[PDB]
Write an enzyme that holds these catalytic residues in place. Structure first.
Site, short mmCIF file in Angstrom:
data_model
loop_
_atom_site.label_atom_id
_atom_site.label_comp_id
_atom_site.label_asym_id
_atom_site.label_seq_id
_atom_site.Cartn_x
_atom_site.Cartn_y
_atom_site.Cartn_z
N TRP A 180 86.81 95.93 7.06
CA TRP A 180 87.73 95.28 7.99
C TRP A 180 88.52 96.32 8.78
O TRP A 180 89.73 96.21 8.93
CB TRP A 180 88.70 94.36 7.24
N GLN A 235 86.10 76.17 25.60
CA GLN A 235 85.75 75.08 24.72
C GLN A 235 86.88 74.08 24.43
O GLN A 235 87.55 74.18 23.40
CB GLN A 235 85.19 75.64 23.41
N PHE A 236 87.05 73.11 25.32
CA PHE A 236 88.18 72.17 25.27
C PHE A 236 88.10 71.24 24.09
O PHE A 236 89.12 70.75 23.57
CB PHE A 236 88.23 71.34 26.53
N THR A 237 86.87 70.99 23.68
CA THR A 237 86.57 70.16 22.54
C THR A 237 87.29 70.64 21.27
O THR A 237 87.05 70.16 20.19
CB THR A 237 85.06 70.17 22.34
#
Lengths: 157, 151
Positions: A68, A84-86
């Site tokens: 990481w 991505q409005f969904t």
């Protein structure tokens, strides 16, 4: 603003052409990140920056010992930023989902372009690829782990 | 429990040079994160919503059919990184994410109920603790997030 960040070996974005049923490849990224980004009704340029900050800056890759450790820019890795409005698609009430809290699509488009633009100023211009706003798109993704990261900026100010 | 639901044309899951171990045509991949304090109740909400959510157009209608309705497939995958808290620094911390041993069990149980509810030929998995390559054909795309600690 909301984002889904998926770590990827590559990704190929393709849309519908000009009978149709013919997908056309417009965006390719090799190693890097993909970002499904949802712009919300009352988003301010402060959320936008925060999204760009975490995308560009979170340490989703590893080195020797260390995990990481490295971020998208350390490895000269690309990003494919897809609107991505969904993501405000509401599923609290009813099995059909309701998008009432997304932004209006003409207001969104301008906001997202602005973001994409800024994305380029905070990295390298040739590393940031994009989809075709509010369009059917078909994207083959190579998830690398997988690694999936969620950030809802309205959890901050 | 959080989940990322994406609509697929299909999906291919592979493990360590690689080797396919599951795949699916149309349906849904769900990256499903398990919170340390989650409840069997917390599963039900996920499974239901996954199985029933109306994410497919019905030639002229919109947001009308589910994976059940269309005898489609689900491929369930266990993202703990979904609980990577990242407000602190640029280095996610998963102090909020369930321990891998109890996790694997909860995952297991969830799969059983995913089968019990839909169809057991219709549910796919990965090797739980291990590195995965999943080619995913994002249809739409249609991305959907739920964190059950809101219902």
């Amino acid at each position: 603003m909301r984002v889904v960040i998926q770590r990827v070996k590559g990704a190929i974005l393709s849309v519908r052409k000009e009978n149709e049923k013919e997908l056309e490849i417009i965006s390719e990224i090799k190693n890097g990140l993909i970002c499904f980004l949802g712009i919300h009704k009352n988003d301010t340029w402060e959320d936008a920056l925060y999204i760009i900050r975490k995308c560009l800056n979170l340490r989703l890759w590893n080195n020797d010992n260390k995990t990481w450790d490295k971020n998208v820019k350390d490895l000269n890795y690309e990003l494919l930023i897809v609107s991505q409005f969904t993501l405000f698609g509401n599923t609290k009430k009813g099995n059909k989902p309701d998008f009432h809290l997304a932004k209006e699509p003409n207001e969104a488009l301008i906001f997202y372009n602005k973001i994409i633009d800024e994305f380029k100023k905070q990295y390298n211009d040739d590393k940031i690829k994009i989809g075709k706003f509010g369009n059917y798109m078909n994207i083959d993704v190579t998830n690398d782990g997988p690694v999936t990261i969620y950030i809802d900026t309205h959890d901050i100010n």
